[PDB]
Homo-oligomer: A and B are copies of this chain.
Amino acid sequence: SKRRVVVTGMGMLSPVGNTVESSWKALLAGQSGIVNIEHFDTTNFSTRFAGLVKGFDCEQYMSKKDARKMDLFIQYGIAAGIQALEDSGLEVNEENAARIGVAIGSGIGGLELIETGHQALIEKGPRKVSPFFVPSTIVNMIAGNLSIMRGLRGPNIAISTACTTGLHNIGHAARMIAYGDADAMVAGGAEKASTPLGMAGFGAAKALSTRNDEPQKASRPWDKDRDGFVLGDGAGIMVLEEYEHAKARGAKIYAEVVGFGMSGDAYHMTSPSEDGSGGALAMEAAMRDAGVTGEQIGYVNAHGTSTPAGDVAEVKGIKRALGEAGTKQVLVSSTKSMTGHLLGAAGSVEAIITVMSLVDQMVPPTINLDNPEEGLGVDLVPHVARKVESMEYAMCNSFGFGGTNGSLIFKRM
């Protein structure tokens, strides 16, 4: 067979909810998840707010003893992963363990436990660093832990491509299923970089919004007053499955993965091609992969991180990739307006969002879009959700630091 790949399970922790359903309901209602940071002293930090996961309870998934061996990014990823597996109804036994794998990464990994470990080294010396330091912090250990907990013995990988992480893991999980390495994969990304070193690091690059007096208004993609991105935490995970295998068990199929495209800006360490041409290359490759034209794409969940340079360039890329006719019929929005930029989880969370839009024939809004840049030639779904009619394909973009770009195209099922 030419092996097709479908989404049969989804799982999510985000600043606007701790399940896919809660998050999606909140997004359709235009709710922000951005709040002040309470868990450390933000006093001389130029940005003091972030998109935080609320009320996270790890004990729902694992013991406090086990959780102590894991940074929160790993706990978040495990939680969304368990959600996704249970949602899929996939059964894992000795017969098929070797055919079920994991592709889950993080952009930065366990910053909090990194900070804690370095503190211990510096205050108490080398012999007082936790024995779990390495496995608690390194980016591949979401995939490691979840495979161990669930007996997943298929391909085990972790892509770490900054803001594109979540998208690339899903894309390559699909590639591996299609190639024959596995019949299912648990795939995505997680991040918890809202720590002192993380906020200072992105602060020092002056990448973040500094609208500290109005956190919920800080993230405003394409708005004339945008001043950098809002950092958020979370996890997004999909169970992907070979189509015949899913059909044969009569699985609920949320969507089909039909295109995955990748490119590099090759421009600058932190700003995008002013062209938007890198983004366009990834979208164009995804479209060719899926065999679709611009008119067939009803929705693009943009990267749209609320940066001056970034937001505008993406619109140029989208127009180039979709063409004139495609551009006229398409809706584009950035849910980062509500969630913030989830970094390693951005791409997987947004892929889930993109799939839900196909499922409900409904597109979430770009909130805070009060005064758009002049001369963008696209409907950016400002303020309020929008219903769509017969949308068969939707696209998710993630365009990260170093110029690493990816797009996924999902098809309605």
Q: Is the CB of B160 within 8 A of A118?
A: no
Q: In chain B, what residue has the closest Cβ to A47?
A: B126
**Interface presence of A34 (CB below 8 A):** no
Q: Which of B156, B181, B402 contacts A405 (CB 8 A)?
A: B156
User: Using an 8 Å CB-CB cutoff, how does the interface string of A133-162 with B read, 1 for contact, 0 for none?
Assistant: 111011111011101101111111111111
Partner of A266, one of B97, B105, B129, B403: B97
Alpha-carbon distance between A52 and B395 when the two chains are bound, in angstroms: 46
Interface residues of A in 259-308 (CB under 8 A from B): 261-270, 278, 281, 285
Cα distance, A203 to B128, chains bound together (Å)? 10
Q: Is A372 part of the binding interface, using a Cβ–Cβ cutoff of 8 Å?
A: no
Residues of B within 8 A of A158 (CB): 159-161, 404
B168 and A157 form a contact (CB under 8 A): yes
A131 on the interface (CB 8 Å rule)? yes
A157 touches which one: B107, B267, B270, B404 (CB < 8 A)?
A: B404
Residues 167-223 of A contacting B (Cβ, < 8 Å) = 168, 172, 175-176, 179, 181, 196-197, 199-207
Partner of A98, one of B121, B143, B281, B401: B281
Residue in contact with A204 in the complex, picked from B133, B138, B263, CB distance below 8 Å: B133
| Binary flags per residue of A397-413, CB closer than 8 Å to B gives 1, else 0 | 00011111100000000
A281 touches B117 (CB 8 A): no
A2–B140 Cα gap in the complex (Å)? 31
CB neighbours of A401 from chain B (8 A): 134-135, 138, 140-141, 144
Instruction: State whether the Cβ of A22 lies closer than 8 Å to any Cβ in chain B.
Output: no
Contact B403 A262 (CB under 8 A): no
For residue A46, CB closer than 8 A to chain B, the reply is: yes
In the assembled complex, the CB of A53 is this many whole angstroms from the nearest CB of chain B, namely 21
Whether A390 sits at the interface, judged by CB under 8 Å, is no
| Cβ-based interface call for A72 (8 A) | no
Contact of A101 with B by CB under 8 A: yes
Q: A61 contacts which chain B residues (CB < 8 A)?
A: none
Query: What is the CA–CA distance of A181 and B285 in the complex, to the nearest angstrom?
Result: 8
The reply to whether A138 and B266 form a contact with Cβ atoms under 8 Å apart is no
Per the bound structure, the CA–CA distance linking A137 and B117 in Å amounts to 17
Partner of A139 from the list B98, B139, B267, B270 (CB cut-off 8 Å) is B139
A–B pairs, 19, beta carbons within 8 Å: A46-B127, A107-B140, A114-B197, A117-B200, A117-B201, A118-B119, A121-B197, A126-B203, A129-B200, A129-B201, A132-B205, A140-B161, A140-B401, A147-B266, A147-B402, A148-B402, A152-B266, A156-B262, A158-B404
Add 6 more A-B contacts to A118-B197, A140-B401, A156-B404 (CB < 8 A).
Answer: A129-B197, A143-B404, A148-B403, A153-B278, A158-B159, A176-B262
